[PDB]
Amino acid sequence: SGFRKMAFPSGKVEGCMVQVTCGTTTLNGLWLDDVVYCPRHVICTSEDMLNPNYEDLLIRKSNHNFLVQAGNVQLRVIGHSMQNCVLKLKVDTANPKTPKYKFVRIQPGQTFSVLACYNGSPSGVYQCAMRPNFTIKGSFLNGSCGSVGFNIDYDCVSFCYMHHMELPTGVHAGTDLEGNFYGPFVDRQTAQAAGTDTTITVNVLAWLYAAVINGDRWFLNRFTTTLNDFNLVAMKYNYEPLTQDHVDILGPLSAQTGIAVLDMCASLKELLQNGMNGRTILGSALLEDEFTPFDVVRQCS
Amino acid sequence: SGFRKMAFPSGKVEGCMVQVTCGTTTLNGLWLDDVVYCPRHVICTSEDMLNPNYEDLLIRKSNHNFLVQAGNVQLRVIGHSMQNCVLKLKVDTANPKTPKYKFVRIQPGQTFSVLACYNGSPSGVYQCAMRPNFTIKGSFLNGSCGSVGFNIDYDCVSFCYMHHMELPTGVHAGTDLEGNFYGPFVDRQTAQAAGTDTTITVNVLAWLYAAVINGDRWFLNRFTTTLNDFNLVAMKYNYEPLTQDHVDILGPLSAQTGIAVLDMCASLKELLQNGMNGRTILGSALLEDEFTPFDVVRQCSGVTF
Numbered sequence A: 001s002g003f004r005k006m007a008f009p010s011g012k013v014e015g016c017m018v019q020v021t022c023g024t025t026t027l028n029g030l031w032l033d034d035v036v037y038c039p040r041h042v043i044c045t046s047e048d049m050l051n052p053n054y055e056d057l058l059i060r061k062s063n064h065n066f067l068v069q070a071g072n073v074q075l076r077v078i079g080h081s082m083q084n085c086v087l088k089l090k091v092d093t094a095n096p097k098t099p100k101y102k103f104v105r106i107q108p109g110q111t112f113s114v115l116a117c118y119n120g121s122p123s124g125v126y127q128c129a130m131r132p133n134f135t136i137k138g139s140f141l142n143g144s145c146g147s148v149g150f151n152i153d154y155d156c157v158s159f160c161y162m163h164h165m166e167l168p169t170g171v172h173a174g175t176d177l178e179g180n181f182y183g184p185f186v187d188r189q190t191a192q193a194a195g196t197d198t199t200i201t202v203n204v205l206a207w208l209y210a211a212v213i214n215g216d217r218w219f220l221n222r223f224t225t226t227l228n229d230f231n232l233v234a235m236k237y238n239y240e241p242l243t244q245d246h247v248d249i250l251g252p253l254s255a256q257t258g259i260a261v262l263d264m265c266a267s268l269k270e271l272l273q274n275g276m277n278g279r280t281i282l283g284s285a286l287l288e289d290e291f292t293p294f295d296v297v298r299q300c301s
Numbered sequence B: 001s002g003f004r005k006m007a008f009p010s011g012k013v014e015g016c017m018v019q020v021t022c023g024t025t026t027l028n029g030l031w032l033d034d035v036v037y038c039p040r041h042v043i044c045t046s047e048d049m050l051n052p053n054y055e056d057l058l059i060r061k062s063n064h065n066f067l068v069q070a071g072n073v074q075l076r077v078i079g080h081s082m083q084n085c086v087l088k089l090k091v092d093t094a095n096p097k098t099p100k101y102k103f104v105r106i107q108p109g110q111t112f113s114v115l116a117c118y119n120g121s122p123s124g125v126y127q128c129a130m131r132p133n134f135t136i137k138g139s140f141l142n143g144s145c146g147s148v149g150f151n152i153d154y155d156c157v158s159f160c161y162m163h164h165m166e167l168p169t170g171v172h173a174g175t176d177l178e179g180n181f182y183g184p185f186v187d188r189q190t191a192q193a194a195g196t197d198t199t200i201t202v203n204v205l206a207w208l209y210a211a212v213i214n215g216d217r218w219f220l221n222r223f224t225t226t227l228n229d230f231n232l233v234a235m236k237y238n239y240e241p242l243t244q245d246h247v248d249i250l251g252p253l254s255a256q257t258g259i260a261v262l263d264m265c266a267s268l269k270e271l272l273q274n275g276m277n278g279r280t281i282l283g284s285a286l287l288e289d290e291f292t293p294f295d296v297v298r299q300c301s302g303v304t305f
């Protein structure tokens, strides 16, 4: 019993964190085999940030301009290339702590753990989701750029996010490990704003099923709904449309609890209408949307 | 910007998790140097959990009854001893991944990271607090016993908790690494219930300061209160008494935000008697009490490990 927001053990990722310095800029790098991946804006100054020509800035750099530090050991950079918004620094030593890994691009609603680092030193681990507006509600300070998001499934680390910027509303934007940004963001200090955020409906439903598995049934009702009627109501609360894929994905939890997805949708409609009336669901007074259907199955039966 | 419930990086602890099997019971062990620490109830079966003379049950056991597994390598047990509710299994091999560590006993309100494991395999890390009723609101399933709680200070892992059991209300109970239970709990099959819980007041105040540092000021007011008037209010709402030590501990956050501790207490007093009025603080509709004053400083400054 118990339901917590849980991050993956960060050990496999900690052994990959390095410090990357270029001039006055110091951020984090991910050292996998003989390559260190980091945000390409490590070559920029604060003035360059408005309209940087990264290819023009990178052509003016040589290997010895990039100082890479793995603990108290400086790594020698023997090459450099840019792949989208990520700089790939070829180093002379392969990381002996390199885990089994892969680079995966996630979709909004998906969750992952963040290992927040400063100066190539991991300082904390937390769990979060890719918001439908492609931002993450992270916890990042100056120097955290290059911190990575990941999932671990049977000894394999799936790297899905690299932190690049903080938007004016306090939310964070970044890329997959191939340097492709999530969302309409650019690595420029130009006027960028996160689009209106929405609640990840499939995740709230998964979390309501986790509440039922943990013995919380107070919010259930005798009603059902059509998928269309659910979405007409959901849209008015800034909830993401529930697709037939979401309904299919919730199938196993529906079978485990004996509550049809469209019956669980009717409970959600009612919760949106009524609020919680001073009650909590899994210790929460708000509807939690940062646990996917797969996280629920993982953590509780 | 951003405020998350954050755990310490678990790497130094992951390199210590082992699987301990004795008879039908499988749980987790903490391998530090040549000793594996685990709950003493691993010797327990059907009649062992009911009327348990743990020294009498342990004296029967031979070293080879305890199967210890560190990854795909079986460790040979060369000795065994009990210290309170923890079994100490002397192994032949010293763990080469043993970090700099110490065993510390924490006080209620203090927070720590828990590396939840199943079969000596770490599966998740979460942050939590020792409740004033000595329970933890953790997330554990069968096989999680022996999972440990810890803090990191520089390069030193301070082991503070070892999971032993789940109470009927879904909360968890365990010991420090010397086998001494937190709270009035015993490690056996008996009617045990967590006492009525209270809110960790100093932690809610720290979290209100973290909200101010993150630009949330809607709950602030022009008012102040005396420590006694706040404590009369806090006692009514099942909040732990705020001591002068708590007020002193909140001093740095008070100096950073310009809000006196008793000034922030008046804000908390109003939140208790009037609620949040449909508003949230740091994305929360409830007053959060699982961030200590130190956690707030560490996260709203950027300390690394």
Ligand SMILES: O=C(C[C@@]1(C(=O)Nc2cncc3ccccc23)CCOc2ccc(Cl)cc21)N1CCCC[C@@H]1c1cn[nH]c1
Pocket (backbone or CB within 6 Å): A025, A026, A027, A041, A044, A045, A046, A049, A140, A141, A142, A143, A144, A145, A164, A165, A166, A167, A172, A186, A187, A188, A189, A190, B001
């Ligand atoms: O601070 C940036 C990147 C930046 C950004 O957003 N950073 C931050 C990230 N996360 C959390 C933060 C919290 C507080 C302040 C800054 C934060 C600045 C704002 O404008 C942009 C715009 C786009 C991009 Cl991709 C990046 C940034 N620096 C970049 C140029 C050199 C100095 C410097 C830096 C030094 N070490 N690492 C980076």
